[PDB]
Design an enzyme around this catalytic site. Structure first.
Site, PDB file in Angstrom:
ATOM      1  N   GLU A   6       0.947  -1.306  -0.032  1.00 49.47           N
ATOM      2  CA  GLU A   6      -0.062   0.023  -0.097  1.00 49.47           C
ATOM      3  C   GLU A   6       0.810   1.236   0.178  1.00 49.47           C
ATOM      4  OE1 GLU A   6       0.325  -1.136   4.527  1.00 49.47           O
ATOM      5  OE2 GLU A   6      -0.067  -2.244   2.477  1.00 49.47           O
TER       6      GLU A   6
ATOM      7  N   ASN B 254       5.596  -7.307  20.824  1.00 51.42           N
ATOM      8  CA  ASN B 254       4.892  -6.490  21.217  1.00 51.42           C
ATOM      9  C   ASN B 254       4.569  -5.995  22.462  1.00 51.42           C
ATOM     10  OD1 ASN B 254       3.403  -6.363  17.940  1.00 51.42           O
ATOM     11  ND2 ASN B 254       5.196  -5.026  18.477  1.00 51.42           N
TER      12      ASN B 254
ATOM     13  N   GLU C  82      30.672 -13.775  11.969  1.00 52.17           N
ATOM     14  CA  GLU C  82      31.006 -13.902  13.323  1.00 52.17           C
ATOM     15  C   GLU C  82      29.801 -14.519  13.916  1.00 52.17           C
ATOM     16  OE1 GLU C  82      33.991 -14.203  14.256  1.00 52.17           O
ATOM     17  OE2 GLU C  82      35.061 -12.184  14.292  1.00 52.17           O
TER      18      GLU C  82
HETATM   19  N1  GTP Z   1       7.066  -3.370  16.538  1.00 53.13           N
HETATM   20  C1  GTP Z   1       6.075  -2.695  15.744  1.00 53.13           C
HETATM   21  N2  GTP Z   1       5.437  -3.433  15.255  1.00 53.13           N
HETATM   22  C2  GTP Z   1       4.459  -2.835  14.265  1.00 53.13           C
HETATM   23  C3  GTP Z   1       4.366  -1.596  13.791  1.00 53.13           C
HETATM   24  N3  GTP Z   1       3.649  -1.542  13.077  1.00 53.13           N
HETATM   25  C4  GTP Z   1       2.923  -2.615  12.549  1.00 53.13           C
HETATM   26  N4  GTP Z   1       3.416  -3.563  13.370  1.00 53.13           N
HETATM   27  C5  GTP Z   1       3.110  -4.925  13.321  1.00 53.13           C
HETATM   28  O1  GTP Z   1       2.416  -5.476  12.225  1.00 53.13           O
HETATM   29  C6  GTP Z   1       1.224  -6.107  12.397  1.00 53.13           C
HETATM   30  C7  GTP Z   1       0.035  -5.553  11.350  1.00 53.13           C
HETATM   31  O2  GTP Z   1       0.523  -6.113  10.169  1.00 53.13           O
HETATM   32  P1  GTP Z   1       1.457  -5.242   9.108  1.00 53.13           P
HETATM   33  O3  GTP Z   1       2.729  -5.523   9.563  1.00 53.13           O
HETATM   34  O4  GTP Z   1       1.067  -3.906   9.307  1.00 53.13           O
HETATM   35  O5  GTP Z   1       0.826  -5.678   7.670  1.00 53.13           O
HETATM   36  P2  GTP Z   1       1.598  -5.110   6.376  1.00 53.13           P
HETATM   37  O6  GTP Z   1       3.079  -5.329   6.383  1.00 53.13           O
HETATM   38  O7  GTP Z   1       1.336  -3.790   6.163  1.00 53.13           O
HETATM   39  O8  GTP Z   1       1.016  -5.914   5.137  1.00 53.13           O
HETATM   40  P3  GTP Z   1      -0.634  -5.751   4.942  1.00 53.13           P
HETATM   41  O9  GTP Z   1      -1.481  -6.723   6.075  1.00 53.13           O
HETATM   42  O10 GTP Z   1      -1.042  -6.191   3.637  1.00 53.13           O
HETATM   43  O11 GTP Z   1      -0.910  -4.305   4.908  1.00 53.13           O
HETATM   44  C8  GTP Z   1       0.902  -5.751  14.038  1.00 53.13           C
HETATM   45  O12 GTP Z   1       0.271  -6.972  14.566  1.00 53.13           O
HETATM   46  C9  GTP Z   1       1.827  -5.175  14.601  1.00 53.13           C
HETATM   47  O13 GTP Z   1       2.512  -6.235  15.539  1.00 53.13           O
HETATM   48  C10 GTP Z   1       5.385  -0.732  14.568  1.00 53.13           C
HETATM   49  O14 GTP Z   1       5.526   0.226  14.165  1.00 53.13           O
HETATM   50  N5  GTP Z   1       6.412  -1.183  15.446  1.00 53.13           N
HETATM   51 MG    MG Z   2      -0.458  -2.552   5.841  1.00 51.82          MG
END
Ligand code: GTP
Ligand code: MG
Ligand code: GDP
Lengths: 376, 96, 55, 437, 431
Positions: D71, D206, D254
């Site tokens: 996206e 998380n 390493e």
């Molecule tokens: N640690 C951390 N985890 C994040 C963050 N943003 C999203 N996540 C993780 O990402 C998950 C949501 O799915 P996304 O990784 O956003 O999915 P995507 O990679 O955008 O792919 P799509 O679902 O197709 O949009 C959540 O469960 C969060 O745990 C962030 O800023 N920091």
């Molecule tokens: Mg997304």
């Protein structure tokens, strides 16, 4: 009580470790002279009602340094609209640039300002130049007084002052009197322009005629964008530190007038708001060998100090000549022995004598460098 | 278990005091023979950064025995068409 | 003038001034301009540094 | 010459990359414009930025990263952010449609039109690199772009780049909280397709970071800003051996051939520690022994799994600052004599320490204090087998009723891939329980 | 670049669509003339999701207003925010629908469907990505019920790969406002269940109840109802228009909320909905938002979730907030109401965060529930349907208009199929 006047300003303190400048809320209470402190971010209670004896109403001065419990706060902002509209009056910045005609009669001028009741907050002795006339291109080529006054600024040093009194723009003008020094002497019998000065542009001051033009003049001068330089030239010289107590109780003018009248020459002038750490580095030689180290550091930190560089044309050596002219250690010993010197006509106790001098006649160069090239 | 500075008499303070004493010894001997870095920079700054006069020409022509400063004018394209690299400012020929 | 399809409220809720709250990643990225108070200035000016060594 | 290519894929990965590149710019002294701080020199003597920045002909440093999201929502914000002129315009690629929590949409159809573009950009960055140590793939197991496109990218990087060690930073689903409902499906499919392609999987959670920020950093309302700043500190401490000098330098190679005992066993746990606020590091000294003890407490772990219920295959201990090689040995000896932490019988020597001279950099706004020491503990342990078992139980609880399968089936994935992935993770559980014994 | 084409069917559909195009006009800072009187660039960054660029700074909505009377089309044109629509996406009939499904679907409404598809095809090839089509109609009516589902069927046949969602107004149990409302609900939801990705089913007496006891207003008219419906529609699609910490568009919602393709009937909800005089005395926070979401009082449909069981929940939080509280309180509500959740879907809540609140509210939240308890609505409509169908009541207005009773039997069989399908997962045990 709960509310008895709540003069609150934003203050900043640099934590020596972790590099932060933490922001606090200073909450000075008049009618009981107390201080309170809030902690911005992580809401808590930093200081209670208390009764701090370092902060007094005359100190404040947004843009200055106050040492409450050895935390060197900088007052930075008029928080609260009440305090803003209550100290826009009473506290007014005004410029007090002494013209080069009174380059040798500044002592009496300081005496009359402190008698009138102007709390000076910053002062320097500056040379200026051709391009350093941003103070005076406002009145741009109206008449040849422009060229004459620019030449007068470039010929001879000046003493820049940052004064303050109640409604200060206007009482400074009253102390100066009107312009045209002959007419000012004709009507005003005791003004600065009447006592010193000859004619137009030889007027010994210029004033701070309008509000925020005073602010523009001070910001060209003293501030975070100040590119002015002191007139320190080193050579055979010595220090003439004037302590904050003697500055506060209307004695700086008398002290500098006595310094000029007995002999010597004031080559560099500077006015400091010292800190705890810097005061300890200056008085680190006065460690546990005299046993007033803490009180001396406290009285340096508890107000503004006057740094002066003293030379002489009498040869010998300036350090020993000045050390003989200054009372040795104590006001009582200076009164009973050699009463014609300093520190006896101006003296309270061993901590607040009146002044400070280079005791060792081999480190005056290093102390002058520390004041005028290092801490500047 | 904790560690204090050598000014506090808790641990290896005697040996730390002897160590800093020997560092003081080394500093005094190096200052005696004059090879400190701070002296080496201070006298460099005091000697090289000293202003000198320039011989004035009465007719605009360069004469033998004049002082002369050889300088380069700044580039006439102070526009930064390539960000990051500074355009050539006013240069003065000097000796390293 | 009885218009039964009018909203009776131009906006739902009123505790605002119309501004936008500067979204979280923008607030994350604008913290790079907060290095002035994170600067490591030294208000411990030592009595000797490199101009007084000759004296 | 010690190059390293970062690939931030997914909406999680883009934000972690935002915090990561803020930290890298601060550490190497690079403005958001991409220049030296108020210039004053260009020099060319400095070379610590070469592992992350490309020194152009203009004296403008550009990052060696690739931002991928299906996206165009967070990549566009990176484009019109403060780090606008820092990133190359073609470097931030994005699509139009998103995978929408669907590993089928990530790995097939939607994912198979930008994979050529991302491999082209990675090829160009690899031709920039002379001496590439490897890849740092920041993604999220949660689903969509971070799972399907990450799996495609890792497969078509493994079949194109030889070994070229790949380090995957994974946002695991927390045991109790999570966001998606098809997240067990997405995690299991992406770990089954990346088990034979990942050299090492830096696992973070998380809920663990939420508890860390609530308990030690003392914020009752933490967020993804703090989470990504902590992860940025972890990866900066990992690559500090590549960047800055130190007493012992522990490179990537390493790390793999010292940490993982077996090729399938490559899922360690991270723990970065100093963990303290700015108003509480003021009063307490942070010694090497106490920060190692803080790492080995079962509350500073970045994954919500108890290491007390499993054995330690290996540990890597990356120190930053003024750590002395005497008290690191004292701390490791104390840890070894402490009987609460159990090591496996076949690994008597199980630590790899590395001391770096550069102190940690405090970010202007973060809750980490300006601390002169740091320790990062990366432990290959058996405690994540419990997380795998819980994930497979959550999988079977839905897959028994065949819920949320028609999306994957209609988007292109065969129905047997779910069963094959379940077989693979059952094999992984059996592998962990036969290694840890 | 993902775009949503809005399609308005009937009286109620046109009115709630006009309110929708008011609320997402003043969310993006669009004046009634059509220009951009905004302040921030976030409004104009993703305006192409719902607006087409025109000459100058104008912005024409990609909405098609369809109704079988001059009527409310004319009133929408005359009213405020009615000069923003293009006067070619304004197809209307000249006869009357007559609250008749057969009249809407087969007779004169059918011959105007060709022009409607011409307009929709033009606006669809004007798109670039075309995430999908949303439709607002009035199940139980005559234009949105039959001709709206004809639009559903033909557009799903035209583009069977894009997200097709409908909001729809279901009949209420109390009061009628239409005698043939059970017919125009039954054989319209029979069409709706086959070829829709997700439907929302916004009831009317629940809108009355929310307006009367959450907002008071004494007499709430129709604008308050349209305002709540419009706020729900904007809060569903806010992630496409504005950035956030955790985005979720329509396909993310469909994937994370639809377990089986026949189970896509949703429970809409909005929070906060506190009254105008009582909003100054409450700290609007995440706990208040979550409780006022998850109470059964705030359901915008008439179904009570306590008699059923939640299959899946979606929570879209609009505004700047720290979402550790959001995650931990989704955990807390799941653990506290674990009886009102299916045990064979662990983590049956989907969290989204979009950090731009709507104008007004500093923070808000949209609730979408896929609770099993929707079978009560279909069961009640089936009871009212078989009350009339056993006695030939009002069937001549369909049969002489031209249809058969076998279509009615097929519709009731499909609704009973929906009821049985929801009832099986109501108490389907795990192990
Ligand atoms: N640690 C951390 N985890 C994040 C963050 N943003 C999203 N996540 C993780 O990402 C998950 C949501 O799915 P996304 O990784 O956003 O999915 P995507 O990679 O955008 O792919 P799509 O679902 O197709 O949009 C959540 O469960 C969060 O745990 C962030 O800023 N920091
Ligand atoms: Mg997304
Ligand atoms: N929420 C809402 N419902 C409405 C509005 N106007 C009418 N309705 C409902 O719509 C139903 C009538 O269907 P209608 O839209 O007239 O069908 P049509 O004649 O074919 O267009 C009634 O049961 C009303 O409750 C409105 O402005 N808002």
């Amino acid at each position: 009580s709960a509310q008895d006047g709540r003069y609150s300003f934003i203050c900043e303190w640099y934590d020596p470790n972790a590099g932060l400048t933490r922001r606090y809320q200073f909450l000075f209470y008049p009618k009981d002279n107390t201080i309170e402190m809030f902690d911005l971010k992580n809401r808590r209670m930093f200081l209670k009602r208390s009764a701090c004896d370092s902060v007094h109403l005359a100190d404040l001065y947004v843009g200055s340094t106050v040492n409450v419990h050895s935390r060197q706060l900088n007052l930075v902002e008029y928080s609260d609209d009440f305090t803003r509209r209550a100290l826009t009056t009473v506290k007014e910045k005004t410029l007090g640039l002494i013209k080069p005609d009174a380059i040798s009669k500044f002592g009496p001028i300081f005496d009359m300002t402190y008698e009138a009741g102007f709390l000076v907050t910053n002062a320097k002795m500056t040379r200026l130049s051709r391009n350093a006339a941003e103070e005076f291109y406002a009145e741009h080529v109206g008449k040849p007084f422009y060229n004459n006054l620019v030449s007068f600024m470039c010929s001879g040093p000046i003493i820049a002052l940052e004064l303050m009194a109640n409604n200060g723009i206007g009482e400074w003008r009253r102390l100066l009197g009107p312009t045209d020094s002959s007419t000012a002497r004709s009507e005003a019998p005791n003004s600065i322009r009447a006592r010193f000065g000859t004619d137009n542009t030889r007027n010994a001051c210029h004033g701070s005629d309008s509000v925020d033009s005073s602010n523009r003049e001070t910001n060209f001068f003293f501030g975070p964008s100040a590119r002015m330089r002191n007139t320190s030239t080193l050579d055979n010289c010595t220090c003439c530190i004037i302590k904050p107590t003697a500055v506060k109780e209307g004695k700086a003018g008398q002290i500098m007038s006595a310094i000029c009248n007995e002999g010597f020459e004031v080559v560099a002038l500077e006015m400091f708001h010292m800190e705890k750490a810097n005061s300890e580095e200056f008085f680190e030689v006065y460690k546990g060998v005299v046993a007033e180290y803490m009180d001396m550091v406290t009285e340096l930190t508890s107000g503004p100090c006057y740094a002066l560089e003293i030379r002489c044309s009498k040869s010998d050596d300036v350090t020993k000549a000045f050390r003989d002219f200054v009372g040795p250690a104590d006001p009582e010993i200076a009164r009973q022995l050699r009463p014609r010197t300093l520190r006896a006509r101006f003296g309270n106790d061993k901590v607040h004598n009146a002044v400070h001098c280079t005791d060792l006649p081999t480190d005056a160069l290093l102390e002058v460098e520390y004041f005028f090239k290092i801490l500047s | 278990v904790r560690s204090y500075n050598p000014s506090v008499r808790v641990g290896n303070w005697n040996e730390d005091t002897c160590l800093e004493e020997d560092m003081v010894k080394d500093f005094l001997e190096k200052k005696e023979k004059g090879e400190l870095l701070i002296q080496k920079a201070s006298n460099l700054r005091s000697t090289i950064l000293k202003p000198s006069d320039l011989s004035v020409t009465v007719d605009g022509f360069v004469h033998f025995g004049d002082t002369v400063v050889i300088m380069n004018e700044a580039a006439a394209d102070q526009v930064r068409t390539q960000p990051g690299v500074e355009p050539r400012q006013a240069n003065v020929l000097s000796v390293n | 003038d009885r218009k039964l399809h009018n909203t009776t409220y131009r906006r739902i809720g009123d505790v605002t001034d119309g501004s936008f709250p500067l979204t979280t990643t923008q607030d994350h990225l604008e913290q790079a301009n907060l290095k002035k108070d994170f600067e490591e200035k030294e208000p411990r000016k030592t009595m000797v540094n490199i101009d007084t060594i000759a004296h | 010459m010690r190059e390293c290519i970062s690939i931030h894929v997914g909406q999680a990965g883009v934000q972690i990359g935002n915090a990561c590149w803020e930290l890298y710019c601060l550490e190497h002294g690079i403005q958001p414009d991409g220049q030296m701080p108020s210039d004053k020199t260009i020099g060319g003597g400095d070379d610590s930025f070469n592992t992350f920045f490309s020194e152009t002909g203009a004296g403008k440093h550009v990052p060696r990263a690739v931002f991928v999201d299906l996206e165009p929502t967070v990549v566009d914000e990176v484009r019109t952010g403060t780090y606008r002129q820092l990133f190359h315009p073609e470097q931030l690629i994005t699509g139009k449609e998103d995978a929408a929590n669907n590993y089928a949409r990530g790995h097939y159809t939607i994912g198979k039109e930008i994979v050529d573009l991302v491999l082209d950009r990675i090829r160009k960055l690899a031709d920039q690199c002379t001496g590439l140590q490897g890849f740092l793939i920041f993604h999220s197991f949660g689903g969509g772009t971070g799972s399907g496109f990450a799996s495609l990218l890792m497969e078509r990087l493994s079949v194109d780049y030889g070994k070229k060690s790949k380090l995957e930073f994974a946002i695991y689903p927390a045991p109790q909280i999570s966001t998606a409902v098809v997240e067990p499906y997405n995690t299991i499919l992406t770990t089954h397709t990346t088990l034979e392609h990942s050299d090492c999987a830096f696992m973070v959670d998380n809920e663990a970071i939420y508890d860390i920020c609530r308990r030690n950093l003392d914020i009752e309302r933490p967020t993804y800003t703090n989470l990504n700043r902590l992860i940025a500190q972890i990866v900066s401490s990992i690559t500090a051996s590549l960047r800055f000098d130190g007493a012992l330098n522990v490179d990537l190679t390493e790390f793999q051939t010292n940490l993982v005992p077996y090729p399938r066993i490559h899922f360690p746990l991270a723990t970065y520690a100093p963990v303290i606020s700015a108003e509480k590091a003021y009063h307490e000294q942070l010694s090497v022994a106490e920060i190692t003890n803080a790492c080995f407490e079962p509350a500073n772990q970045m994954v919500k799994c108890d290491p007390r219920h499993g054995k330690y295959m290996a540990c890597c201990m990356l120190y930053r600052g003024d750590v002395v090689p005497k008290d690191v040995n004292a701390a490791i000896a104390t840890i070894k004599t402490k009987r609460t932490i159990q090591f496996v019988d076949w690994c008597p020597t199980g630590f790899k320490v590395g001391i770096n001279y550069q102190p940690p950099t405090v970010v202007p706004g973060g809750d980490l204090a300006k601390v002169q020491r740091a320790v990062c503990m990366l432990s290959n342990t058996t405690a994540i087998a419990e997380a795998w078992a819980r994930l497979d139980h959550k999988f079977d609880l839905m897959y028994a009723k065949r819920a949320f399968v028609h999306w994957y089936v209609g988007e292109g994935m065969e129905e047997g891939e779910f069963s094959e992935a379940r077989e693979d993770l059952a094999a992984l559980e059996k592998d962990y329980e036969e290694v840890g014994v | 670049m993902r775009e949503i084409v809005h399609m308005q069917a009937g009286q109620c559909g046109n009115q709630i669509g006009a309110k929708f195009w008011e609320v997402i006009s003043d969310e993006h800072g669009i004046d009634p003339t059509g220009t951009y009187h905004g302040d921030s660039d976030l409004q104009l960054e993703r305006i192409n999701v719902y607006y087409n660029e025109a000459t100058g700074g104008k912005y024409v909505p990609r909405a098609v207003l369809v109704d079988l009377e001059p009527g409310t089309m004319d009133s929408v044109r005359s009213g405020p925010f009615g000069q923003i629509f293009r006067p070619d996406n304004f197809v209307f009939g000249q006869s009357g629908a007559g609250n008749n499904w057969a009249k809407g679907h087969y007779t004169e409404g059918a011959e105007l469907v060709d022009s409607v598809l011409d307009v929709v095809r033009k606006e669809a090839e004007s798109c670039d990505c075309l995430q999908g089509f949303q439709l607002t109609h009035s199940l139980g009516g005559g234009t949105g019920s039959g001709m709206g589902t004809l639009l559903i069927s033909k557009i799903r046949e035209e583009y069977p790969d894009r997200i097709m969602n409908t909001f729809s107004v279901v009949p209420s149990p109390k009061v009628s406002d239409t005698v043939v409302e059970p017919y125009n609900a039954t054989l319209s939801v029979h069409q709706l269940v086959e070829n829709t990705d997700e439907t929302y089913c916004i009831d009317n007496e629940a809108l009355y109840d929310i307006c009367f006891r959450t907002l008071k207003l004494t007499t709430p008219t129709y604008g308050d109802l349209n305002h709540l419906v419009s706020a729900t529609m904007s809060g569903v699609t806010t992630c496409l228009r504005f950035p956030g910490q955790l985005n979720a568009d329509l396909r993310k919602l469909a994937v994370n909320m639809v377990p089986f393709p026949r189970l896509h009937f949703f429970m809409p909800g909005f929070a906060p909905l506190t009254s105008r005089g009582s909003q100054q005395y409450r700290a609007l926070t995440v706990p208040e938002l979550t409780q006022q979401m998850f109470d059964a009082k705030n359901m915008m449909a008439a179904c009570d979730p306590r008699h059923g069981r939640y299959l899946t929940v979606a929570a879209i939080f609009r505004g700047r907030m720290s979402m550790k509280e959001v995650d931990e309180q989704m955990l807390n509500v799941q653990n506290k109401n674990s009886s009102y959740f299916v045990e064979w879907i662990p983590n049956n809540v989907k969290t989204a965060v979009c950090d731009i609140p709507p104008r007004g509210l500093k923070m808000s939240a949209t609730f979408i529930g896929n609770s099993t308890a929707i079978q009560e609505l279909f069961k009640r409509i089936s009871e009212q349907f078989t009350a009339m169908f056993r006695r030939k009541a009002f069937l001549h207005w369909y049969t002489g208009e031209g249809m058969d009773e076998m279509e009615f039997t097929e519709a009731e069989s499909n609704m009973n199929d929906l009821v049985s399908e929801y009832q099986q997962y109501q108490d389907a045990t795990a192990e």
